[PDB]
Design a protein around this nucleic acid. Sequence first.
RNA 1: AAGUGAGAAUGCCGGUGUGAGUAGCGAAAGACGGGUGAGAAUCCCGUCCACCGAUUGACUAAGGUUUCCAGAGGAAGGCUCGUCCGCUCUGGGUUAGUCGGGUCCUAAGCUGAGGCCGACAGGCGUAGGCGAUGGAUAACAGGUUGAUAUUCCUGUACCA
RNA 2: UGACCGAUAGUGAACCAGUACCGUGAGGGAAAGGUGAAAAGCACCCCGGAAGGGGAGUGAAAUAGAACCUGAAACCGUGU
Lengths: 47, 56, 89, 119, 43
Amino acid sequence: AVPKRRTSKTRKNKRRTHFKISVPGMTECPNCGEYKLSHRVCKNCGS
Amino acid sequence: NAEHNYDMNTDELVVKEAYANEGPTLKRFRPRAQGRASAINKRTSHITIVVSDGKE
Amino acid sequence: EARDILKRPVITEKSSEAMAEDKYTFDVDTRVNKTQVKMAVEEIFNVKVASVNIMNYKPKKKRMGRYQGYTNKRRKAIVTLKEGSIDLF
Amino acid sequence: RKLGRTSDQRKAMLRDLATSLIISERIETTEARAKEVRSVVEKLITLGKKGDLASRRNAAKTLRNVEILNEDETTQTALQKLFGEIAERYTERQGGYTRILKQGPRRGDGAESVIIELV
Amino acid sequence: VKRTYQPNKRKHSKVHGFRKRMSTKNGRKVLARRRRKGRKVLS
RNA sequence: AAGUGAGAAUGCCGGUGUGAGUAGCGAAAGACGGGUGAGAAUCCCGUCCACCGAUUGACUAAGGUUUCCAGAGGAAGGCUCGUCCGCUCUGGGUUAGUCGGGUCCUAAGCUGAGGCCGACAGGCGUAGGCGAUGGAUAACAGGUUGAUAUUCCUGUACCA
RNA sequence: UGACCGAUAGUGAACCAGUACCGUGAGGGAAAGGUGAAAAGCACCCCGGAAGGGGAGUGAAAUAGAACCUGAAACCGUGU
């Protein structure tokens, strides 16, 4: 129930290979000079 | 900073480097069970960002 | 004596409302009684006082601005007449 | 069907939302809550179309018996407005048709904010 | 549960104090030690 | 001429790691509208709903010792958030002849001039002195403040 | 006066010391020195609610800006 040995800087950086965030949809507004969320609306993004 | 000091373009700009160094951390304490107490750390960051134009 | 028993008067928003009911508040010494102040305000101001009320004040803590310290204790006394006028402002 | 709290608690909350969406036109809440109050509000508008005594008694089993309208400057008690104004304004095949508009997430947590207006 | 050390003003000035330590010779030696050390609080 | 050479003593002290973005985040049921602001699930007002219900109610005592009221905040602080605060900074707030005590009186005990006993230190004891948790002593109806009320004010009585 | 110490040394204490704190009590008992020659301690403009930056200015020096002489390892990052 307790780590027998300590992890290195190579085995610790290998586990953080999938630990990341994905990019958003960024549905560019038709004509308003803003940015609306995918299938959403904003006070600046007209479309 | 590159619009009043250098007065360059804005549409033709690209972020060159972008990192974050560590800073001084504060030490706190949390009372556990059976009288023993643990420790808590409050680390800080030194976010830095430089903007270029695709040329030196 | 009858001069060192009276320090300074209290000028706040509560003492200003007591002027309409003829009740002046003063800061006396922390060793006088409720009879020595009746013979010190009836001679310095020459006015026949009616009754007198006193109250003790404990010392406060301090402030982070300077360093850990303490405050001096004070003794308030509300003297009220019924024919005399004011002697301060 | 979806959940959230306990059987009784859920029921109570649902009734509150429905009554609050009948005397305020448009309101803004969460996604799941807006996708569950769009089936208990449309059924109430269907009972208001009939305009019979039986329906009126069945419409008082959900609508809260309070919330006296203050914007009408009178003694309107929800039901009257629903069986007089809301009912006398809809003639579509979707009875109490309602639309929902999605928006950005909240700051507190990550719940997706949404708006449900009457149509 | 009921713990120890029950606060009591009168009792605190009875078992200890300056009038109780200045009543015996054994308790008068503890007032000299603290004074020598430089303690800012004596009983 | 020496405090002269460090890799190990479950060695002493300080700083930073690994476990890991993992375990945990410790009493009631909340929902929406309006307001404030650079920023609101969390602050302010409103309506509905619910919980305690011989108590999570109201008041004496012990104990703690400004945490109480108002105005302004940069963080630190608060197991999230914060424009909020039992947190920081200014300036304020506790009124008694009758209310609790002190003062009168004594109980258990604790100290005692002469007086016994003891290498010394110091023990014990007679009148006396001290010592309440008990005895003896005199208030009510109302009106008012951002913070005090049998105490301030108004009427009216009682004790010395 | 010294083939004595020079901030983990020398007094427990070079500074806020018998002080923070710990215990019913007798008692136990820390950590913490250094900008520059002189505050000349960043006037002014730009981004931000502020904090903090980027120019400019003071200086021999600003990678000397009060986390203020020198700045070593463990540890954490970006480019190649």
